[PDB]
Design a protein around this ligand. Structure first.
Ligand SMILES: Cc1cc2nc3c(=O)[nH]c(=O)nc-3n(C[C@H](O)[C@H](O)[C@H](O)COP(=O)(O)O)c2cc1C
Ligand SMILES: *CC(=O)CC[C@H](N)C(=O)O
Ligand SMILES: O=C(O)CCC(=O)C(=O)O
Ligand code: F3S
Length: 1485
């Protein structure tokens, strides 16, 4: 999406402004999307003032006196096409106006030209007319629009796509539709009419994840245009709906408030909802600015910029008890008709750039160079920083900046005073050290009864207590889905966490913690629309985990509080109805805190009792409070024995709990600590006192929640609280709809009676030590695991001799039900053909992929051997996210007769045609060794959004594993842990992904780009977006897949089966006509030709293998990959261990033959000759006739079997060989004979070009041609390329040595993304009417992943400057937040003010900051870097020399002045120094 506004504060309204708005819209075209016809637009529109000169004709035609400016109401109405339905609608619109006691003047037909629409938009088109209205009593302005709003809502109870009021206002009007940008004004004749005039325009071009256009869903909506995605929508909607019955505001009657009722609706888009909820807040007394400060509040805590504005802190402090954020990426552009403004989400995940002239003319938008204004007139170029707003007061003719706007709102009420008097704060640093139970067997028995298992305490609780963090582990979740297990499991295990991918980003819970909060509020949620001291009478918890001391203080507190039991003597089903009824009645009696205890009156669980599992209890009370209209009266505390893991807490808050007392878990820690075995081990060298174990355990939980919220990009637990950021697998419909309403659950599992049967299994075990199941590690007693040490061994043997493949196959076939595919079997429609007729192994093998395992997680022996193997086969390997040694790009020459090569001496089993070049080069959030030559060496390029083991998160390589070798490849520091950021800092939305894919197709026009997703509900939709974004291939990873290190909780509770994933993507693509755009690839636990065929039938065209491939080359399933101790040399970097690796490429060539030969024999059974014939043939599947579940009668597999008929139509299998970027500026640069000469003869050349914002990634196709011929450093020539104007995204991305790029103007985001060499210079027009150092000239995430090169910019940057810089050098003149965020080397100089969170995660390299204000120490992330004054002469001279070069390239008056007064300013620099540069000559002496 693209969004913006233009305002003319000082002049008469004109047509010129409207033209500029159409043209800016034109400039955002590449941010938009189109329907299946490739013609109709996903949406565009414009909001303007009511066009008074245009409607003066309508009155003149009727011989009618025109009402004055604020007295004419105009409704832009979408009406039905059918003649009689249209008149019914017209009459009804007339009717509700009459009943609101206003006067209908008549209707204006909207002049339109339909012949310009695309065929889908033409078929959907509503009939468009405007109704004109006045008030007979005298109504005007605020009161009129307030009555118009009441009237529009009423009409809106009959909302259809056919019947929709775009705007009903005496000040604003919205022209929108399902069109491309430059079609908007061709379709709406009024917009080209020189009588259409306006002092402002808000504009929007929409990008949607679908093919089917709906005119109402274009933007702007009534008040606002929205670029972004709400990521807590279900929660935000449930809370808001609960408030609707009981709306109350002075100078509103009840009837007027009821007329608005459907305020919120889970069936309208997230934007339609936010708009509607926002207008409620405006029409009832607040400016749009204030309303947006409530719905989408700033990250105000520990904001140093707020030091001087405590009323602003007070404002948010108050409201954060009343209203949770509508979170996720957001640029909002809004207009009242009185004010026109914009504001950013709390983390600023969309760009907003603005521009101000000498006449206070202002242009804001997603991109900078988009309205052409004479540059000499520009007096300021700025940007919005995270959470910031800017507005225009149209009447007063004033530009309002961030702090004024916000102070004007905060100071309206003594919010601080109210909090100080009314809020009770409940926090205790100290625990209860004294035990709950006294004897020994009691805690054991209770633990057994509440579902604890030996691995729960030993592998989850204990590490949390002892180490102060949730456990790290490795490999994938190898065991059965909870619903398929014969092993007892808790209700929690049926729930899979959801996570962000593509359409919105994860956030970094560690580097960007400062923006997140675990704070919660207990009690009556107060009146949102009318601020009162009362609303602040609440109990604030600093964290959802409440200890024993804290709970007593709550119970002692200033609120009414009621114990409600979850125990019962009768059936869970009825036990739960009495529960729900007791809650309802208890709140209706006046209680403000309900404590659902499974230990009522202090008493313990006996054998004569059972319980309602706490997730079911709270799910149930939350939704029934809601259904009874009572959820705002009370908060839920869960006092429960059955909560211990990080996942458990997340489900609880997520399904309605404000807080949890995990009393048995706290006791489990107390009894773990007390206990002579544990004491014996703390005395001889396992690690701690008891208050610390307790403190550590709480710290683990809290860190674990930060992690989980962040996988979805959510900052505040308060937002997560409503929302139900889960998919359920194995829960039947009655249950879901009972306790978990709105959760998807696709496969129909358990009834309420079945969950009882499961608690009773645990009850049977309770009424010696806890039982150990094989959950985490294989056991002979234990749960099934598909990768077991013996399966491995026998496979390793079968591969070793060119029968042993039998035991391996049978160990895999004597399996209990494990995955969804196991419930399936074949049902052939042809008779079986001979095996000789089936396509050859060599033909099948071309579809296999080896899967992207980082060079750090694996050894270069393991990693290279797979590449050679896969290249021999004619298939593909994937260099995962650790970059790749250049030595590997060349075919091997020097293989001797024993099959050794001095080029690759650590490998064995080689022949002369081999190459260890990975056919797939991966691009991941760390960008580790991501180089133009690395990019040119791929046949394919893969953008990794997520992997099955840890979808919400970034890659993870422990410091033990970062050898000198790994550090060299990644351009990082040797001993240092690498936790990659969870988002690509490049991809905060679908249109950002389109831009990354563009950059890849730019550098390497012949390479396919793939996008790697993880299976979860919503992947269908996301994948439609990815295809529209021009990808070639979509990978689907199952929850299943391996890893060299992930959180154990992530391995076990995040992500869904790939069966649900492939299927969902295949269907959505097909039913949207997008299926031929992409090749689909699948992975996650694939081992077997059988697996291959299942995947094929469900719609996969290629097949990925990770863990299995490691097993072929010698992996056992020792499962210490995260440890550096791999006993067999596959997943370690210790040299002496690498030396154990026996392993030759042939062994893995052999493995893929067994697979392919099994494919052939399954193709024989079915009677088809090639996978090409069966891909997507779902009607060839059936439900296995012999299976019997432990936990429910059976599942329901309709969602896996009901795919669209594929017997006849097979054209979707034909793909374009590579998608083009279209005609690009760089092509004209390369077709120039002076340029071709410069490249061929390594001579000098020079060219100059005018640019516009649609000119994106300039330079980069020329880098790619250079690196193709010479790699990164062979080019001895010199090309200067001079540009004038506003550069689009990724200017100078992947720059090489020998490239000088000069830009006179400004640039949008991602300047010098992956820069590797050469020089980028960016200066303002010499004409400029401003001090260059005070003004923005480049955008966000410049030098992302930079690996070399020099950048000089005579202006300010945005956020994440030099985000993950490895070797880049730069001098800029100011920046936003998160400067040098994951920097590992290079040098960054910033000659002006800088935002907060500097050097977060900064682990190597040095930065210099000029600080004239004195407050930079306030703005540093203090976790790694130290700040010091410059004292080392070598550092002084590093700085000078960089500033000296800025000046030579740039002419920067700020640099000159600095050099001229060198000693005056030296002492004003701070140097940022990570503890890895501390003894560098530039930091020390
Ligand atoms: C040792 C290990 C390291 C991996 N590292 C990466 C990574 O660098 N990049 C990535 O996209 N996936 C990574 N993963 C995920 C795999 O690429 C692949 O998606 C997954 O292993 C397939 O599931 P499977 O292990 O059951 O075959 C890795 C997997 C393992 C086993
Ligand atoms: C492109 C964009 O930011 C989408 C906005 C909103 N979610 C929608 O229109 O679907
Ligand atoms: O090497 C890395 O940085 C990450 C590899 C990884 O995330 C994994 O082992 O799953
Ligand atoms: S599990 Fe990992 S630790 Fe080694 S044996 Fe396999 S690579």
């Amino acid at each position: 999406c693209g969004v913006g506004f233009i305002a003319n504060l000082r002049g008469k309204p004109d047509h010129t402004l409207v033209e500029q708005a159409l043209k800016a819209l034109g400039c955002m075209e590449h941010r938009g999307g189109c329907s299946a016809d490739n013609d109709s637009g996903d949406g565009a529109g414009v909001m303007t003032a009511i066009p008074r000169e245009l409607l003066a004709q309508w009155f003149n035609t009727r011989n009618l006196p025109m009402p004055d400016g604020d007295r004419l109401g105009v409704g832009m109405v979408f009406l039905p096409q059918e003649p009689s339905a249209r008149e019914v609608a017209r009459a009804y619109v007339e009717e509700v106006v009459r009943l609101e006691k206003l006067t209908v003047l008549g209707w204006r037909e909207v002049p339109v030209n339909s012949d310009v629409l695309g065929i889908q938009a033409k078929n959907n088109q509503p009939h468009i007319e405007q109704i004109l209205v006045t008030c007979p009593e005298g109504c005007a302005g605020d009161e009129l629009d307030r009555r118009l709003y009441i009237a529009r809502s009423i009409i809106g109870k009959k909302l259809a796509e056919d019947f929709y009021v775009c705007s009903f206002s005496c000040r604003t009007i919205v022209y929108k539709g399902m069109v491309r940008s430059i079609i908007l004004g061709e379709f709406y004749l009024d917009l080209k009419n020189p009588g259409y005039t306006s002092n402002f325009a808000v504009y929007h071009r929409r990008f949607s994840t679908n093919t089917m256009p709906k005119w109402p869903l274009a933007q702007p909506m009534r008040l606002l245009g929205h670029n972004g995605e709400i990521n807590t929508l279900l929660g935000n909607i449930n809370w808001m709906a609960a408030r609707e019955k009981e709306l109350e505001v002075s100078g509103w009657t009840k009837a007027e408030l009821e007329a608005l009722t459907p305020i919120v609706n889970q069936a309208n888009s997230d934007s339609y909802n936010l708009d509607s909820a926002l207008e409620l807040l405006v029409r009832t007394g607040r400016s749009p600015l204030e309303a947006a400060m409530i719905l989408v509040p700033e990250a105000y805590k520990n904001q140093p910029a707020l030091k001087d504005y405590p009323e602003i802190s007070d404002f948010h402090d108050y409201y954060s008890g009343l209203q949770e954020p509508w979170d996720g990426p957001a640029l909002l552009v809004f207009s009242d008709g009185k004010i026109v403004g914009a504001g950013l989400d709390r983390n600023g995940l969309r760009p907003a750039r603005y521009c101000i002239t000498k006449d206070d003319y202002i242009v804001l938008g997603s991109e900078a160079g988009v309205v052409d204004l004479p540059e000499v007139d520009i007096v300021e170029k700025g940007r919005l920083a995270p959470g910031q707003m800017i507005a225009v007061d149209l009447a007063e003719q004033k530009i309002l900046k961030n702090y004024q706007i916000k102070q004007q709102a905060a100071q309206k009420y003594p919010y601080g005073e109210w909090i100080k008097i009314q809020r009770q704060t409940v926090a205790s640093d100290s625990f209860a050290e004294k035990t709950l139970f006294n004897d020994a067997q009691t805690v054991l028995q209770q633990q057994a009864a509440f579902g604890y298992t030996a691995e729960d305490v030993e592998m989850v609780v204990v590490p949390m207590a002892s180490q102060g963090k949730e456990p790290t582990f490795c490999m994938g979740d190898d065991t059965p889905l909870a619903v398929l297990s014969h092993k007892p499991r808790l209700l929690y295990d049926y729930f899979k966490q959801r996570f962000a991918q593509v359409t919105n980003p994860p956030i970094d819970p560690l580097r960007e913690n400062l923006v997140m909060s675990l704070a919660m509020f207990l009690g009556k949620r107060g009146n949102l629309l009318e601020p009162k001291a009362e609303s602040a009478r609440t109990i604030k918890l600093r964290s959802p985990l409440v200890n024993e001391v804290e709970l007593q203080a709550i119970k002692t507190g200033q609120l009414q509080v009621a114990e409600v039991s979850t125990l019962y003597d009768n059936s869970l089903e009825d036990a739960l109805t009495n529960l729900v009824k007791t809650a309802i009645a208890t709140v209706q009696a006046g209680a403000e805190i309900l404590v659902l205890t499974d230990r009522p009156n202090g008493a313990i669980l006996t054998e004569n009792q059972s319980f309602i599992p706490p997730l079911l209890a709270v799910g149930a009370v939350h939704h029934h409070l809601i259904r009874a209209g009572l959820r705002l009266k009370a908060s839920l505390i869960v006092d429960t024995a059955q909560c211990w893991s990080t996942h458990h807490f997340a489900c609880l808050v997520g399904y309605g709990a404000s807080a949890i007392c995990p009393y048995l878990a706290l006791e489990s820690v107390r009894q773990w600590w007390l206990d002579e075995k544990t004491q014996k081990l703390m005395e001889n060298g396992r690690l701690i006192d008891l208050p610390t174990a307790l403190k550590n355990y709480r710290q683990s939980v809290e860190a674990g929640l930060f992690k989980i919220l962040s996988k979805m990009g959510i900052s505040l637990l308060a937002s997560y609280h409503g929302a139900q950021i889960f998919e359920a697998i194995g829960l039947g419909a009655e249950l879901v709809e009972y306790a978990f309403a709105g959760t998807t659950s696709r496969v129909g599992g358990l009834t309420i009676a079945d969950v009882a049967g499961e608690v009773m299994v645990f009850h049977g075990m309770a009424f010696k030590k806890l039982e150990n199941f094989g959950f985490v590690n294989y056991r002979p007693g234990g749960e099934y695991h598909m990768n077991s040490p013996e399966m491995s061994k026998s496979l390793h043997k079968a591969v070793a001799a060119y029968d042993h493949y039998e035991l391996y196959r049978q160990y895999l076939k004597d399996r209990p039900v494990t995955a969804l595919r196991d419930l399936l079997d074949f049902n052939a429609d042809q008779p079986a053909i001979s095996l000789e007729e089936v396509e050859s192994v060599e033909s099948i093998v071309k579809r296999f992929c080896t899967g992207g395992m980082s060079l750090g997680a694996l050894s270069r022996e393991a990693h290279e051997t797979l590449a050679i193997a896969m290249n021999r086969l004619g298939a593909k390997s994937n260099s995962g996210e650790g970059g790749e040694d250049v030595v590997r790009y060349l075919t091997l020459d020097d293989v001797d007769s024993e099959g050794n090569s001095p080029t690759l001496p650590h490998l064995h089993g080689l022949q002369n045609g081999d190459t260890a070049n990975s056919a797939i080069k991966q691009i991941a959030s760390g960008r580790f060794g991501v180089t133009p030559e690395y990019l040119m060496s791929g046949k394919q390029l893969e953008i990794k959004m997520a992997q099955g083991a840890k979808p919400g998160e970034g890659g993870q390589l422990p410091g033990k594993k970062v050898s000198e070798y790994i550090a060299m490849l990644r351009r990082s520091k040797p001993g240092v842990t690498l936790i990659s950021p969870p988002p690509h800092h490049d991809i905060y939305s679908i249109e950002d992904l389109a831009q990354l894919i563009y950059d890849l197709h730019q550098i390497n026009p012949e390479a396919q780009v793939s996008v790697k997703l993880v299976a979860e509900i919503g992947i269908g939709t996301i994948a439609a977006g990815v295809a529209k974004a021009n990808a070639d291939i979509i990978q689907i990873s199952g929850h299943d897949g391996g890893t060299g290190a992930s959180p154990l909780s992530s391995i076990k509770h995040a992500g869904s089966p790939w069966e649900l994933g492939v299927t969902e993507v295949h269907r959505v693509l097909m039913e949207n006509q997008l299926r031929d755009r992409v090749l689909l690839r699948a992975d996650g636990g694939l081992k077997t030709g059988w697996d291959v065929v299942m995947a094929a039938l469900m719609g996969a065209e290629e097949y990925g293998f990770g863990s299995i491939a490691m097993i072929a080359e010698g992996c056992i399933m020792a499962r210490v990959c995260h440890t550096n101790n791999c006993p067999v040399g596959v997943a370690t970097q210790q040299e002496r261990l690498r030396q154990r690796f026996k392993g030759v490429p042939g062994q893995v060539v052999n493995f893929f033959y067994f697979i392919a030969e099994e494919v052939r024999s399954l193709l024989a059974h079915l009677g088809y000759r090639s996978l090409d014939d069966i891909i997507g043939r779902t009607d060839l599947l059936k439900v296995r006739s012999d299976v019997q579940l432990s936990k429910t009668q059976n599942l329901t597999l309709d969602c896996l079997l009901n795919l669209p008929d594929t017997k006849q139509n097979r054209q979707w299998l034909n793909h374009e060989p590579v998608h083009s970027n279209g005609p690009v500026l760089d092509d004209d640069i390369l077709a120039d004979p002076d340029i071709q000469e410069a490249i061929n003869h390594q001579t000098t050349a020079t060219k100059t070009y005018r640019l516009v914002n649609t000119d994106r990634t300039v330079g980069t196709r020329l880098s790619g041609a250079i690196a193709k011929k010479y790699g990164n450093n062979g080019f001895e020539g010199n090309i200067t390329l001079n540009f004038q104007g506003a550069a689009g995204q990724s200017f100078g991305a992947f720059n090489l040595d020998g490239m000088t790029l000069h830009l006179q103007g400004e640039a949008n985001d991602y300047v010098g993304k992956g820069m590797n060499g050469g020089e980028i210079v960016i200066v303002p027009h010499p004409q400029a009417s401003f001090a260059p150092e005070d003004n923005v000239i480049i955008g966000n995430t410049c030098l992302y992943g930079a690996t070399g090169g020099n950048l000089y910019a005579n202006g300010r940057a945005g956020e994440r400057f030099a985000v993950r810089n490895s070797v880049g050098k730069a001098v800029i003149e100011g920046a936003g937040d998160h400067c040098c965020e994951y920097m590992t080397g290079g040098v960054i100089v910033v000659l002006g003010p800088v935002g907060r969170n500097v050097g977060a995660g900064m682990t190597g390299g040095l930065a210099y900051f000029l600080d004239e204000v004195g407050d930079l120490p306030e703005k540093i992330n203090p976790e790694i870097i130290t700040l010091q004054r410059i004292t080392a002469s070598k550092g002084e001279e590093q700085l000078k020399s960089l500033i000296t070069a800025h000046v030579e390239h740039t002419g920067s008056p700020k640099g000159k002045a600095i050099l001229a007064n060198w000693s005056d300013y030296l002492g004003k620099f701070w140097q940022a120094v990570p503890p890895s540069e501390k003894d560098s000559p530039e930091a020390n002496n």
